[PDB]
Structure 1
């Protein structure tokens, strides 16, 4: 799909919310972005919809510098939060219910 990439070089919005605002009017027909953002935008705008099926299903993640002592403990805390139900509560508070 390298030629596809060429068609994305003429237009490439240097922001994230700017492209959504542009799509609000008929200036950019199709946007391609992470699902966890587009879904919230669709839920909170009631004017845009998500089409297709998810591809490249790789999740988010806290970063850290290579060879850093924080990796093990940060990963452990994230997993404990996932199991504890904290992440579900956070998603309900800040993403869903719009």
Structure 2
């Protein structure tokens, strides 16, 4: 995001988009939360639409 919004493109990521950790962003929830299944279904529906 910073490289995209950077002016002049003086900064760049190595490898033309190299990723090592290859993990993601998730919505943390309490253990055994009743909202987990519904929230997972909502995210999957959003990404599928």
TM-score band, normalised by shorter chain: 0.7 to 0.9
Q: Which residue of 2 aligns with 1:75?
A: 40
In structure 2, how many angstroms separate the alpha carbons of the residues matched to 1:66 and 1:78?
19
Runs of 4+ more than 2 Å apart: none
Q: How many residues align?
A: 45
Of Structure 1 and Structure 2, the greater strand share is in 1
Of Structure 1 and Structure 2, the greater helix share is in 1
Q: Which residue of 2 aligns with 1:58?
A: 23
Q: Which runs of 5+ in 2 are unaligned?
A: none
In structure 2, how many angstroms separate the alpha carbons of the residues matched to 1:42 and 1:57?
18
TM-score (norm 2): 0.81
In structure 2, how many angstroms separate the alpha carbons of the residues matched to 1:65 and 1:47?
42
Q: Which residue of 2 aligns with 1:15?
A: none
Q: Which runs of 5+ in 1 are unaligned?
A: 1-39, 85-98
In structure 1, how many angstroms separate the alpha carbons of the residues matched to 2:21 and 2:2?
20
Q: Which residue of 2 aligns with 1:42?
A: 3
When the two chains are superposed, the root-mean-square deviation of aligned CA atoms in Å is 1.0
* Shift, 1:59, TM fit: 1.1
